[PDB]
Amino acid sequence: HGYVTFPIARQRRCNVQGGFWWPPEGTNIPDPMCRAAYQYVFNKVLSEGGSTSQAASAAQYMFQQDNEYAALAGPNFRDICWIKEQVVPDYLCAAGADTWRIRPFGDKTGMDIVGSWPPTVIPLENNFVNTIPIELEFCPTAIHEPSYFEVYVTTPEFNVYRDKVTWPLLELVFNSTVPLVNRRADSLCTANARVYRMIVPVPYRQTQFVIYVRWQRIDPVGEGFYNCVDAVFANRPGPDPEDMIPPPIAYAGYTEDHTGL
């Protein structure tokens, strides 16, 4: 059990911001996308003939269980084709949990809605570099060893405004067992004194992208944890220093009236 604390996992961010315990309709949830996630599940339960209590419970469960975005793979867990087709074939940011009446894993599909999910902004010092090392921190709430981590990044064509995170849009960037280490004084992970930190070589992007983290138990039941992490690089402004030779308003209104429609 656990979640990504850096860059913060999408579901962990929603849980941390709170406001979802009351009113039951999700109206005190401050972030528009977290509120939409909650309301999606809440309205899905009501549409299936559930009571307001059942609907609030299902939507709250999705936020409360931010450390249990899990799926059971069974003994074939090492085979990514088995994972892709039978374990987490859909609703990747929910780790495939789409049954509000059955807990675990409930229905966490609100977290897989498409839209302007707020990303972690990673500033670049150089815009021409194609691999940016990120020290990812994963915050375990239970120590389940032996296990291993896989990290994927969305392909360059992925568009967060349009596309679901799906396996044909993901590329493997990291695959390793990772040691449990003491958290630093600046962590982030308040839930545990120890964390898993790993250097992930993130490919450059000029678009908002998703980092998809998989923590898989090396075990016969094959429980694995899956988290979507929203991120974007901020390109450094100004001219390319290598181009540079050394020395020896009604326009917005206009734009609005003359585009589209």
Ligand SMILES: *[C@@H]1O[C@H](CO)[C@@H](O[C@@H]2O[C@H](CO)[C@@H](O[C@@H]3O[C@H](CO)[C@@H](O)[C@H](O)[C@@H]3O)[C@H](O)[C@H]2NC(C)=O)[C@H](O)[C@H]1NC(C)=O
């Ligand atoms: C991440 O790295 C691990 C470790 O290298 C990869 O694990 C390897 O996964 C394959 C399955 O895709 C295993 O192969 C299978 O081996 C059995 C023999 O026991 C055989 O019957 C199957 O036909 C198949 O060849 C392989 O054993 C396993 N290696 C270890 C050390 O467990 C894993 O696949 C990598 N993940 C990704 C997404 O590539």
